[PDB]
């Protein structure tokens, strides 16, 4: 099985799972720890933002590669905003702060 770009989920905007749906391999928390054990931070930023769920950061990443450039933009993952709304859907107020 292999996948470059396929169809994405509906709520978290992450790639689907399984061979039938042309999904990508899950990059679990153990692999996150393995990357943290190295000095790898840019690779982790890639796997978390520009390959999985940064909607505004992966469309530009595809355009950069076809243009010959190899550079990312950190963006902001869309799997964390939803969480905020979820916690904001309760009586709890969780918010970000100033620059």
């Amino acid at each position: 099985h292999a996948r470059s770009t396929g169809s994405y989920s509906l709520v978290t905007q992450q790639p689907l799972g399984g061979k039938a749906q042309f999904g990508g391999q899950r990059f679990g928390e153990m692999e996150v720890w393995a990357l943290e054990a190295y000095g790898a931070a840019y690779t982790l930023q890639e796997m978390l933002t520009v390959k999985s769920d940064d909607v505004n950061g992966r469309t530009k990443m595809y355009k950069n590669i076809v243009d010959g450039n190899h550079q990312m933009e950190p963006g902001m993952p869309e799997s964390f905003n939803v969480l905020l709304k979820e916690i904001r859907s309760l009586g709890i107020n969780i918010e970000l702060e100033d620059e």
Partner: protein, 73 residues
């Protein structure tokens, strides 16, 4: 044609600074202009830069001074 980075790691303090300076040099060489200082052998940009580091002709302060000189224009 690069199988290890021992020479580059020895040339600079630690591996992380080597990664950062090599990334800066490779981006300078790749996005626009900045022809290599070493004869390439059909190598990728990330490899030509690393050799430049092991030759001792590129490090953090050299890149800084060249960038300052070019921005002074």
């Amino acid at each position: 044609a690069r199988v290890t980075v021992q020479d580059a790691v020895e040339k600079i303090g630690n591996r992380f600074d080597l990664v950062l300076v090599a990334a800066r040099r490779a981006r300078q060489m790749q996005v626009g202009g900045k022809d290599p200082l070493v004869p390439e052998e059909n190598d990728k940009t990330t490899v030509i830069a690393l050799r430049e580091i092991e030759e001792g002709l590129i490090n953090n302060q050299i890149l800084d001074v060249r960038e300052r000189q070019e921005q002074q224009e």
